[PDB]
Amino acid sequence: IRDFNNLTKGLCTINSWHIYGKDNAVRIGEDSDVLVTREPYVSCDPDECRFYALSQGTTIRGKHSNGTIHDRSQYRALISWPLSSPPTVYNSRVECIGWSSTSCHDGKTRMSICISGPNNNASAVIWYNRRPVTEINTWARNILRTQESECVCHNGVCPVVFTDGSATGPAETRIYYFKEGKILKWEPLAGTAKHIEECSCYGERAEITCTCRDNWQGSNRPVIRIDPVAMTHTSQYICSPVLTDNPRPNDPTVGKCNDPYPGNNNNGVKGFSYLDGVNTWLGRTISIASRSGYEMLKVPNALTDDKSKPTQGQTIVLNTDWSGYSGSFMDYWAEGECYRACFYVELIRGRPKEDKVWWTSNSIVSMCSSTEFLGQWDWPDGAKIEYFL
Amino acid sequence: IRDFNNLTKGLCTINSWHIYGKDNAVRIGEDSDVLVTREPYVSCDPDECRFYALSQGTTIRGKHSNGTIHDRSQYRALISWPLSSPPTVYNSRVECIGWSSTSCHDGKTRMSICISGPNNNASAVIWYNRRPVTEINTWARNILRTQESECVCHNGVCPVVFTDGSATGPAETRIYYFKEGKILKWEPLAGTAKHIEECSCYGERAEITCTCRDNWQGSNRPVIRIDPVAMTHTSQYICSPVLTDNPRPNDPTVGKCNDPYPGNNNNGVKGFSYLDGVNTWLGRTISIASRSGYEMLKVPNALTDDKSKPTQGQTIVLNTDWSGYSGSFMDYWAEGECYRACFYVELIRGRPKEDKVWWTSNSIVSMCSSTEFLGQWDWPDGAKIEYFL
Amino acid sequence: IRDFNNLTKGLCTINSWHIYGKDNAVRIGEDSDVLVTREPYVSCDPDECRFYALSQGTTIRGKHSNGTIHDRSQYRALISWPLSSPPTVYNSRVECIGWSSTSCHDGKTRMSICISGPNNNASAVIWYNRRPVTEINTWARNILRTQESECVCHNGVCPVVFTDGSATGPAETRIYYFKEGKILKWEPLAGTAKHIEECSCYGERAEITCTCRDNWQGSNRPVIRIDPVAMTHTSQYICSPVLTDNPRPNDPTVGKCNDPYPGNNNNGVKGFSYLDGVNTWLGRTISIASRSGYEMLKVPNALTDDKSKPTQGQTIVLNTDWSGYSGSFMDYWAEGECYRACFYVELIRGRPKEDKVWWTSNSIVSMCSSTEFLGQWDWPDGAKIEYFL
Amino acid sequence: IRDFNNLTKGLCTINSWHIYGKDNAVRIGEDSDVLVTREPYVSCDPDECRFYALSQGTTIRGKHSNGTIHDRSQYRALISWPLSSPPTVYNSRVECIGWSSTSCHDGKTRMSICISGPNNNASAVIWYNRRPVTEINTWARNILRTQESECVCHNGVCPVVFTDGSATGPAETRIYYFKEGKILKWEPLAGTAKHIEECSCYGERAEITCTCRDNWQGSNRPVIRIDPVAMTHTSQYICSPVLTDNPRPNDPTVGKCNDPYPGNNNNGVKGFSYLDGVNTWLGRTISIASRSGYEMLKVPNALTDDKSKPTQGQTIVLNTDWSGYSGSFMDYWAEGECYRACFYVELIRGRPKEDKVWWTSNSIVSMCSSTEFLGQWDWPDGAKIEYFL
Ligand SMILES: *[C@@H]1O[C@H](CO)[C@@H](O[C@@H]2O[C@H](CO)[C@@H](O[C@@H]3O[C@H](CO[C@H]4O[C@H](CO[C@H]5O[C@H](CO)[C@@H](O)[C@H](O)[C@@H]5O)[C@@H](O)[C@H](O[C@H]5O[C@H](CO)[C@@H](O)[C@H](O)[C@@H]5O)[C@@H]4O)[C@@H](O)[C@H](O[C@H]4O[C@H](CO)[C@@H](O)[C@H](O)[C@@H]4O[C@H]4O[C@H](CO)[C@@H](O)[C@H](O)[C@@H]4O[C@H]4O[C@H](CO)[C@@H](O)[C@H](O)[C@@H]4O)[C@@H]3O)[C@H](O)[C@H]2NC(C)=O)[C@H](O)[C@H]1NC(C)=O
Ligand SMILES: *[C@@H]1O[C@H](CO)[C@@H](O[C@@H]2O[C@H](CO)[C@@H](O[C@@H]3O[C@H](CO[C@H]4O[C@H](CO[C@H]5O[C@H](CO)[C@@H](O)[C@H](O)[C@@H]5O)[C@@H](O)[C@H](O[C@H]5O[C@H](CO)[C@@H](O)[C@H](O)[C@@H]5O)[C@@H]4O)[C@@H](O)[C@H](O[C@H]4O[C@H](CO)[C@@H](O)[C@H](O)[C@@H]4O[C@H]4O[C@H](CO)[C@@H](O)[C@H](O)[C@@H]4O[C@H]4O[C@H](CO)[C@@H](O)[C@H](O)[C@@H]4O)[C@@H]3O)[C@H](O)[C@H]2NC(C)=O)[C@H](O)[C@H]1NC(C)=O
Ligand SMILES: *[C@@H]1O[C@H](CO)[C@@H](O[C@@H]2O[C@H](CO)[C@@H](O[C@@H]3O[C@H](CO[C@H]4O[C@H](CO[C@H]5O[C@H](CO)[C@@H](O)[C@H](O)[C@@H]5O)[C@@H](O)[C@H](O[C@H]5O[C@H](CO)[C@@H](O)[C@H](O)[C@@H]5O)[C@@H]4O)[C@@H](O)[C@H](O[C@H]4O[C@H](CO)[C@@H](O)[C@H](O)[C@@H]4O[C@H]4O[C@H](CO)[C@@H](O)[C@H](O)[C@@H]4O[C@H]4O[C@H](CO)[C@@H](O)[C@H](O)[C@@H]4O)[C@@H]3O)[C@H](O)[C@H]2NC(C)=O)[C@H](O)[C@H]1NC(C)=O
Ligand SMILES: *[C@@H]1O[C@H](CO)[C@@H](O[C@@H]2O[C@H](CO)[C@@H](O[C@@H]3O[C@H](CO[C@H]4O[C@H](CO[C@H]5O[C@H](CO)[C@@H](O)[C@H](O)[C@@H]5O)[C@@H](O)[C@H](O[C@H]5O[C@H](CO)[C@@H](O)[C@H](O)[C@@H]5O)[C@@H]4O)[C@@H](O)[C@H](O[C@H]4O[C@H](CO)[C@@H](O)[C@H](O)[C@@H]4O[C@H]4O[C@H](CO)[C@@H](O)[C@H](O)[C@@H]4O[C@H]4O[C@H](CO)[C@@H](O)[C@H](O)[C@@H]4O)[C@@H]3O)[C@H](O)[C@H]2NC(C)=O)[C@H](O)[C@H]1NC(C)=O
Ligand SMILES: OC[C@H]1O[C@@H](O)[C@H](O)[C@@H](O)[C@@H]1O
Ligand SMILES: OC[C@H]1O[C@@H](O)[C@H](O)[C@@H](O)[C@@H]1O
Ligand SMILES: OC[C@H]1O[C@H](O)[C@H](O)[C@@H](O)[C@@H]1O
Ligand SMILES: OC[C@H]1O[C@H](O)[C@H](O)[C@@H](O)[C@@H]1O
Ligand SMILES: OC[C@H]1O[C@H](O)[C@H](O)[C@@H](O)[C@@H]1O
Ligand SMILES: OC[C@H]1O[C@H](O)[C@H](O)[C@@H](O)[C@@H]1O
């Protein structure tokens, strides 16, 4: 009775952002059985949207929260839970086991991907309709890894971006095209992006756009544009001088379209953009040095205009509060003639910036676009670290 | 397969009130993971009735409960949970994010509205079928705010009363008429009510009646009567000398139909009435000074008779116990030829009246009408504050 | 699509009892959020059987557990929860509010009844399909009260036995016949039973048999047999000298069919029997003085034979362990040509017998009949009281 | 609308194993309400796979966890819970009561079997569609007991292996053939296996293969092959010199097909194999002395070749970590032309090996086969015992 979803609509006009979800997980977890997480995201099914993240297999107050600054262990899993509830022991659904993930619904059912293993011997398991269907072994033997936010599907084809290799030099990025959890095709990265991590993707009018993290040399963000019908892609960087990785140098007046904008090496943060002509909005941390603050900037033609500057903006998280990863999603099953852009921001608490506790976790805030020009508030995690001492 | 509900029935004859629900949330939350709340209510779908409230994004025993006397923060959300269970971390569904709300089912699906933001820049998000559909920016830049109990729908049209502006002088009240979460029309307040807050509404025979709080000058309650087909309304005050706001002066022998009954300024409490000729019942606190006690009084023709006094009553909460906000709802999908009036009372515990704890929360008690003349009990919150010290 | 259930089958031959359910609630609640309860029972829907009990509106470890020896408060409610799970804050469904209850499914949906109020002004609320439908005021102004185990329905007619009046003298017992939560008829108690409390009922071949507690004078149990088609009944006592109330005198060699067997006044315990000719089994405590131990005895023709003695038995709970109330239920929707008799035993822990704790609660054990002659085990609550100190 | 499942497919080619599930129960239970368990397994329905285990009727942190090294009590039950979640008080479903179990879905609904009682008087209760249908009394009066992992069905016939009698000498093993919870037939053990415990079974091409534990004399594993259409079986031992019980002597160069391989008496561990010609994989502990480590070895023709040695392998749990019972299951309702072999390993923590705590419990790890040659990781329980002190 269900058909595959097709990306038949364009983006709605984004004139501001409204609050969509917030879980207050760290506040609540100070005195309830909330799992330690990081790398969260949001993804919709045709009848529900849910929060997702990588659990660390312990509660925050639990003694096993000590050491959760670490990224890869056998105790991590992709979990999902109801929108704006916290990720608790009792309400979280485990989608698959591992320390890197993506997930998306194709209109009929959901594909989830988790990678696990030691650094030199990791493998992806691709689940479809809550069953494992395909496995992929590491090709470069160096932390096979993927998006950490939702993938996007079109007529059953769900492309996913993976990287295997160094985070501080050339690596081997591949785009896999899945259908019903099976590999139709894969391609090596093409175009002018020089390094790819942690792609944040969205779809509109039969094209999928991903904004990624050049961890090696670039403080501008690489962009991959995927045609899920032809199963081909292109890549470049956001041309705009409004630089959106972190850490980063100060904004110049002219950016770079086909190479990394230099100044900071071997670091970054997962982030996102919506690239739609004049209707283009970029997210970034406010700090150029650290994962603090978060703002959206309207930067008309950021993708293609190497001198484009902001014409409007919205503060999401004050620079006096911690942010983190951010990513895109949309409710492809909503009513109306256009898709409304959404995003989330991971609000990281604990280590390394707050080292009086022994753990690292996060909460989530999420916003979607409005055609109104709405007033802005800031949305901090809200927990008091001293309470955990 | 579902059609919009129509208000085709009149009210059942109210001869007494029977216990409908009670969650004992503060008792239970002394040793379980119960969220701090305030501004609760009850609302029915065609196949379930649920408790609703504004969470404070912390448990009661949690250290973040300190400071929850405050009304507006980024950590509040409209939550719902099963009838007479407590609002726990693990059983509460987040409907939307914000610090002021309303919600109602139209027979097909549910509309929920949450307002958030700083005082001078708040916005409403109107959700329908669990998706955001419309947003409304503040028009007076002073705590845009709404009912804090359920709205009512008729043939898909669900009117909602909002206020923006001062709580201690003239403000800008609007009635919005929504259908499928979209704005059909709005109107500014008309009639003789001089200030409107926190409307408590019910529907019968194609009319919606709301009893509100005149926070500015009136200790009688303003009333708005809305025709959801014509999308028009009128307003006045309850004429009766049985005054039902709090705090209030002592009852006179003659009330006021078209102006605030004076004596107390710049305060009030959310409350409700059922105004149905001889079948008219008013709720109020027992104390004229504080939110303590709660009683129902049968006051025939209270709406229109400026000398009407009680002919029957029922004590709901003794004056030696704390009460709080109260509001109306009905199960529009019940069997029978008439709609049975129901209400809830918020039983506030903690600050400011019980200041040995650092938190403010509440539990809920709820009653519905009977055509029998039933014996009465009183229904306290039941928690011992000393246990929380 | 569902029709009312009819009692078309006879009882299966009972040759022994097998374990059906057990919740270990007190053990588990020593370190999890388990509600304090008493007066439990079991009742089936067409697609699920559940545990039921009167909550006390606090967890066991909670400070509000102090005082829960008391029977009637505003903090009690009928709750249900999944078979053999414990009654927790997070998995318990509130069916109605009050301190006395019954509940049964008619094949289409469930009727639940809760009574609340002060001793001289109590009222029953009859819920059907999870909505209140009928209310009944106290008729004798002295703790209106009902079965504390499931009722039984036949072609939509669900009789329920109520008592109002003294527990230590003549009282006013009524049988109400409900359909879809509405009163079709009621009758005063007739026959030779002189006092009725806490009836435990089952149905077979279009008749409902209830075994009750004569709290006033009788240590034999009164029996009410109800024809739910004619809506009439009879009553007498179990004739057998195998006395089954508690406390009680020692067993004589000849019982009494039409009067209380004397020796103990003004006390008792809820209990049950299956009265089916040679296929007759009685439950009782092992102790004649206290609620300790529990055994089933096959006593052919106990109902009608005033010299009938046991021919077989099964120990359920050793006399060195606490028991409590017990009652009957069956899964009227099971497969097969006959109905299998089941029962539960309430295993009371805490006050008054274990007074080093300040609370009273219980767990549940439940058995059903087998046509095999199965080996027996004993089934204690299993908690160590010292752990709660 | 559902038909009985038939075993129409063969096994997929097993070239390695991928992570399927892991619950981290002991880590998480250090600070959440996780039930103490042992003897876990996994079993699929047509629309969900779940974890199963025998609860001990207490949480790990609870004071009643003291003494849970013991195997048989009245506080045990078969529980199930969602895949890779932990077995918590609030998310666990009780399937039946007892201290030995099996369970399987026949394509229409699920059969579950639990045994309880004292050692000399135990009985099995066979539940079907969540109702008790058949009971079986002990035949040898010495701990009637069964598989502790899933059974397998074919056209409605679900064979189950039981043992009653000594664990240290000849015993009375029976194969029962159930359909809709009713006994069609049973047979005594035939063939050359000399003692049978704790069979781990799987089905393919209309045959069911079970690998068991010879607790008496054998360090090779007995195998029972059952034809569920003819309702007949055969038995022998795995011929291979790759010995897979524990404890065990060192591997010889030639095994035994029709007798126990000697060297260790009166002990063992539940384990499993997939016996499919060249596509044969055996699981075993790494240690020959204790339940530590776990590895899979590809041993072509292990069943029939008494000199067969490994040609490939995969380490699942390092020898420096505790393992435990292991068993087979498959998702018979997955897509594709073949059934993918899966297994679980019980990771036992606490007593007797870690005796600074007073409890014994476990977590679960589970893997399924891949046709890829995937890299390997090890999968420890992950809890730090010192945290529980
Ligand atoms: C209630 O809520 C509402 C709604 O949210 C609030 O209103 C919002 O207020 C915020 C804050 O002011 C606004 O965001 C800022 O928007 C401006 C862009 O708008 C300005 O510029 C526009 C473009 O002008 C240029 O081009 C036009 C033609 O296209 C031309 O006409 C003009 O002459 C000029 O050449 C103007 O069009 C626009 O005017 C319009 O709107 C006005 C209202 O804002 C109105 O008054 C006008 O009439 C007209 O209608 C307006 O002038 C962004 O520039 C700004 O972002 C910069 O600054 C913030 C800090 O404030 C910074 O964090 C951003 O990153 C960014 O600045 C950095 O990057 C730049 C780009 O590289 C760089 O140049 C800067 O130096 C700076 O760089 C440094 O910091 C970064 C980050 O740390 C670092 O990486 C660098 O290295 C470096 O160190 C904000 O986004 C909203 O747009 C506004 N919304 C609406 C709908 O009005 C309202 O205030 C609330 N009310 C109350 C009472 O609180
Ligand atoms: C078992 O349960 C049952 C059921 O619940 C219990 O029975 C209930 O008992 C309660 C408590 O007594 C009753 O509530 C009160 O009801 C009266 C109204 O009924 C009286 O008056 C009626 C009207 O009489 C006038 O008009 C009629 C014609 O219409 C005329 O005939 C008559 O002469 C007179 O002119 C009478 O009809 C009625 O009689 C009927 O019922 C009697 C039983 O009650 C029965 O005996 C008769 O035969 C007949 O059938 C009866 O006399 C309310 O007036 C009263 O409310 C006032 O008082 C309470 C405190 O008790 C107060 O809190 C209320 O706010 C209110 O008083 C305040 O406001 C007034 C209005 O402005 C003001 O005038 C007062 O001075 C007072 O004001 C002060 O306090 C307020 C609040 O703090 C403050 O704001 C002000 O500023 C100021 O300081 C109660 O609601 C139930 O009706 C009754 N139910 C039933 C079905 O019987 C039963 O008791 C329980 N059993 C046991 C053993 O416990
Ligand atoms: C493995 O599990 C199995 C299955 O559970 C275990 O087997 C079960 O074992 C138990 C315990 O022994 C049995 O329960 C008892 O059953 C007897 C009834 O059976 C006896 O009597 C039958 C009737 O005999 C009379 O009539 C027949 C004709 O109808 C006639 O032939 C005969 O001559 C005589 O006239 C016999 O038919 C029956 O024999 C059959 O079964 C035998 C096996 O049991 C077998 O050996 C035979 O071959 C034959 O097949 C048998 O002799 C009940 O009487 C007994 O209940 C009384 O005693 C218990 C305490 O043990 C007490 O708590 C009960 O309340 C009751 O006694 C009180 O009440 C009486 C009635 O008023 C009174 O007379 C007593 O004085 C006593 O009263 C005192 O205490 C009470 C309570 O505290 C107090 O209120 C009073 O005031 C007073 O102070 C038991 O129910 C099971 O039936 C049996 N099941 C099966 C299937 O075999 C097996 O043991 C386990 N294995 C192991 C190794 O553990
Ligand atoms: C990334 O991940 C990948 C994938 O997991 C990792 O690659 C895996 O690496 C592991 C570990 O090395 C491998 O497992 C071992 O496999 C060998 C079997 O393969 C060897 O032997 C094969 C058979 O050879 C014989 O026959 C062939 C013809 O059939 C003939 O040609 C040959 O001459 C010989 O006669 C070879 O075919 C095979 O070669 C192939 O693969 C090689 C890669 O492995 C490749 O290099 C070749 O080119 C070729 O393609 C290979 O040589 C198992 O033997 C071994 O299991 C034994 O040893 C482990 C300990 O390491 C032990 O725990 C096992 O129990 C077992 O040894 C015990 O039992 C034996 C049987 O009775 C006994 O003989 C031993 O003495 C020993 O007994 C003692 O211990 C036990 C247990 O404690 C005790 O009970 C006894 O009493 C006694 O005390 C392993 O299973 C994987 O197969 C391999 N997978 C793949 C796909 O490559 C990779 O390493 C990872 N990368 C990194 C960087 O980490
Ligand atoms: O009816 C008057 C009062 O009587 C008391 O016994 C009840 O407990 C109160 O709740 C009631 O208000
Ligand atoms: O492959 C051999 C070993 O390599 C290690 O790096 C992995 O962590 C182990 O799990 C593995 O068994
Ligand atoms: O060594 C790092 C590991 O320490 C503990 O196991 C932590 O619980 C785990 O999250 C972390 O990966
Ligand atoms: O400053 C007031 C705030 O303090 C803390 O954050 C409380 O948890 C929050 O409820 C409150 O709004
Ligand atoms: O006074 C007796 C009452 O004390 C406390 O409220 C107990 O929590 C309650 O159960 C009991 O009814
Ligand atoms: O005596 C052993 C028993 O002790 C306690 O009851 C434990 O909680 C239980 O698991 C165990 O069987």
How far is Cα C306 from Cα C303, in angstroms, rounded to an integer?
8
Say if the Cβ atoms of C375 and D117 lie within 8 Å.
yes
The C-alpha angle A292, A18, A304, rounded to 5 degrees, equals 70
Give the type of residue at B262: P
In this structure, the residues whose C-beta lies within 6 A of any atom of ligand 8 are: A 382; B 56, 58, 64, 67-68, 70, 73, 75
How far is Cα A24 from Cα A308, in angstroms, rounded to an integer?
36
Bridge partners (DSSP) of residue B208 are B203, B226
> From its phi and psi, is residue A332 left (phi > 0), alpha (psi between -120 and 50) or beta?
alpha
Rg of chain A over Cα atoms, rounded to whole angstroms, equals 19
> What are the chain A neighbours of B57 within 8 Å (beta carbons)?
24, 27-28, 382
Task: Return the half-sphere exposure (C-beta side, CA atoms, 13 A cut-off) of residue B316.
Answer: 34
The C-alpha angle A111, A117, A120, rounded to 5 degrees, equals 120
Q: What is the DSSP string of A140-197?
A: SSS--B--SS----BTTBEEEEEEEE-SSS-EEEEEEEEETTEEEEEEE--SS----E
Token output for A239: 């041309």
Three-class secondary structure of residue C64 per DSSP: helix
Which candidate from A57, A121, A137 shows the least CB-CB separation from D24?
A57
The 10 Å Cβ neighbour count of residue D244 is 26
Give the number of residues written for chain D: 389
- Residue C285 Cβ inside 6 Å of ligand 9? The answer reads no
Say if the Cβ atoms of A28 and B57 lie within 8 Å.
yes
Which candidate from B22, B30, B33 shows the least CB-CB separation from C62?
B30
Give the number of residues written for chain B: 389
Which residue range forms the structural domain that includes residue B162? 1-389
Is A277 exposed, middle or buried, given 0-12, 13-18 or 19+ CB atoms closer than 10 A?
exposed
Closest protein CA for atom 10 of ligand 9: C68
Q: Which helix (H) or strand (E) is B26 found in, with range?
A: helix B25-29
Q: How was this structure determined?
A: X-ray
**Residue C233: partners with Cβ closer than 8 Å, 6 or more residues away:** C159, C175, C187, C190, C191, C224, C225, C226, C227
Q: Which helix (H) or strand (E) is C343 found in, with range?
A: strand C342-350
Instruction: Confirm if A342 and A316 have CB atoms less than 8 A apart.
Output: no
Instruction: Confirm if A231 and A185 have CB atoms less than 8 A apart.
Output: yes
How far is Cα B114 from Cα B101, in angstroms, rounded to an integer?
5
How far is Cα A192 from Cα C98, in angstroms, rounded to an integer?
72
Q: Which of C229, C259, C222, C225 is nearest to C244 (CA)?
A: C222
**Residue A340: partners with Cβ closer than 8 Å, 6 or more residues away:** A11, A12, A330, A331, A334, A368, A369, B132
**Residue D1: partners with Cβ closer than 8 Å, 6 or more residues away:** none
- Please report, in angstroms and rounded to a whole number, the separation of the first and last CA atoms in chain B: 54
Token output for D295: 């590895």
How far is Cα C240 from Cα C305, in angstroms, rounded to an integer?
6
Q: Which of C90, C173, C182 is nearest to C127 (CA)?
A: C182
Q: Which of D2, D7, D4 is nearest to D207 (CA)?
A: D7
> From its phi and psi, is residue D63 left (phi > 0), alpha (psi between -120 and 50) or beta?
alpha
Say if the Cβ atoms of D64 and C27 lie within 8 Å.
yes
Give the type of residue at D294: Y
**Residue B384: partners with Cβ closer than 8 Å, 6 or more residues away:** C63, C64
Say if the Cβ atoms of B383 and C64 lie within 8 Å.
yes
> From its phi and psi, is residue C116 left (phi > 0), alpha (psi between -120 and 50) or beta?
beta
> From its phi and psi, is residue B293 left (phi > 0), alpha (psi between -120 and 50) or beta?
left
Alpha carbon distances (Å) from A213 to A103, A155, A217, C53, C374 = 19, 28, 10, 57, 68
Bridge partners (DSSP) of residue D134 are D126
State yes or no: D378 annotated in a binding site: no
Chains that touch C (3 or more CB pairs under 8 A): B, D
Torsions phi, psi for A60 (to 5 deg): -70, -45
C137-174: b (≥16 Cβ within 10 Å) or e: bbebebbbbbbbbbbbbbbbbbbbbbbbbbbeeebbbb
Torsions phi, psi for A385 (to 5 deg): -55, -35
Token output for B190: 């008309």
Q: Which of D149, D148, D105, D141 is nearest to D123 (CA)?
A: D141
CA C306 to chain centre: 25
- The C-alpha of C119 sits at a distance from chain B's nearest C-alpha, in angstroms, of 10
Residue of A202, A325, A332, A344 marked catalytic = A325
- The C-alpha of C263 sits at a distance from chain D's nearest C-alpha, in angstroms, of 36
The 10 Å Cβ neighbour count of residue B85 is 25
The 10 Å Cβ neighbour count of residue A70 is 12
Q: Which helix (H) or strand (E) is D347 found in, with range?
A: strand D342-350
How far is Cα C75 from Cα C63, in angstroms, rounded to an integer?
14
Alpha carbon distances (Å) from B320 to B138, B382, B384 = 40, 12, 13
Instruction: Confirm if B149 and B161 have CB atoms less than 8 A apart.
Output: no
Catalytic residue status for A344: no
Resolution of the experimental model in angstroms, please? 1.6
Pairing of strands D338-339, D10-11: parallel
**Ligand 2 centroid vs B310 CA: distance in angstroms?**
7
- Residue A277 Cβ inside 6 Å of ligand 6? The answer reads no
How far is Cα C193 from Cα D345, in angstroms, rounded to an integer?
61
Bridge partners (DSSP) of residue D209 are D202, D225
Which 119-138 residues of chain B touch chain C by CB within 8 A?
Answer: none
Residue of B237, B325, B339, B344 marked catalytic = B325
Instruction: Confirm if D22 and D379 have CB atoms less than 8 A apart.
Output: yes
E-assigned strand segments in B214-359: 222-227, 232-237, 273-274, 281-284, 292-298, 312-322, 326-329, 338-339, 342-350
CA C119 to chain centre: 22
Q: Max Cα separation, chain D?
A: 55
> From its phi and psi, is residue D104 left (phi > 0), alpha (psi between -120 and 50) or beta?
beta
With an 8 Å Cβ cutoff, is A368 touching chain B?
yes
Q: How many domains does chain A have?
A: 1
**Residue B318: partners with Cβ closer than 8 Å, 6 or more residues away:** B286, B293, B378, B380
E-assigned strand segments in D150-221: 158-165, 171-179, 182-188, 197-204, 207-213
- For residue D168, what is the DSSP state? S
**Residue B118: partners with Cβ closer than 8 Å, 6 or more residues away:** A375, A377
> What are the chain D neighbours of A135 within 8 Å (beta carbons)?
18, 370, 372, 374
Q: Which of D201, D285, D282 is nearest to D242 (CA)?
A: D282
> What are the chain C neighbours of B368 within 8 Å (beta carbons)?
132
Task: Return the half-sphere exposure (C-beta side, CA atoms, 13 A cut-off) of residue B371.
Answer: 9
CATH assignment of the domain containing B53: 2.120.10.10
Q: Is the dihedral of CA C263, C266, C272, C274 positive or negative?
A: positive
- For residue D341, what is the DSSP state? P
Please report which ligand is nearest the Cα atom of D119: 3
Task: Return the half-sphere exposure (C-beta side, CA atoms, 13 A cut-off) of residue A228.
Answer: 29
Instruction: Confirm if B164 and B344 have CB atoms less than 8 A apart.
Output: no
Which candidate from D31, D334, D384 shows the least CB-CB separation from A131?
D334
- For residue B28, what is the DSSP state? H
Q: What is the DSSP string of C176-238?
A: EEEETTEEEEEEE--SS----EEEEEEEETTEEEEEEE--SS-SSPEEEEEETTTTEEEEEE-
Bridge partners (DSSP) of residue D369 are D17
Instruction: Confirm if B357 and B68 have CB atoms less than 8 A apart.
Output: no
**Ligand 4 centroid vs D297 CA: distance in angstroms?**
8
**A384-389: long-range contacts (C-beta < 8 A, 24 or more apart)?**
A384/B63, A384/B64, A385/A349, A385/A350, A385/A354, A385/A356, A385/A357, A386/A356, A387/A30, A387/B63, A387/B64, A388/A30, A388/A60, A388/A61, A388/A357, A389/A356, A389/A357
Ligand 3 atom with minimal separation from the D141 CA: 104
Chains that touch D (3 or more CB pairs under 8 A): A, C
How far is Cα C106 from Cα B88, in angstroms, rounded to an integer?
32
The C-alpha angle B267, B269, B275, rounded to 5 degrees, equals 125
Catalytic residue status for C325: yes
- Residue A376 Cβ inside 6 Å of ligand 1? The answer reads yes
Is the preceding peptide bond at A352 cis, omega within 30 degrees of 0?
A: yes
Chains that touch B (3 or more CB pairs under 8 A): A, C
Pairing of strands D342-350, D16-22: unpaired
How far is Cα D331 from Cα C339, in angstroms, rounded to an integer?
35
State yes or no: B321 annotated in a binding site: no
**Residue A386: partners with Cβ closer than 8 Å, 6 or more residues away:** A356
Give the type of residue at A18: H
Token output for C305: 């034979």
Q: Is the dihedral of CA D303, D308, D313, D315 positive or negative?
A: positive
Torsions phi, psi for D11 (to 5 deg): -70, 140
> What are the chain A neighbours of D374 within 8 Å (beta carbons)?
123, 135, 137
- Residue D224 Cβ inside 6 Å of ligand 4? The answer reads no
D255-291: b (≥16 Cβ within 10 Å) or e: bbbeebbeebeeebbbbbbbbbeebbbbbbbbbbeeb
Bridge partners (DSSP) of residue C215 are none
Give the type of residue at B242: V
Instruction: Confirm if A21 and A51 have CB atoms less than 8 A apart.
Output: yes
How far is Cα B286 from Cα A312, in angstroms, rounded to an integer?
53
How far is Cα C62 from Cα B384, in angstroms, rounded to an integer?
11
Residue of D nearest to A130 (CA): D48
Choosing from A73, A121, A138 the residue with most ligand 6 atoms within 8 A of its CB, the one to mutate for a pocket test is A121
Token output for D170: 């000849």
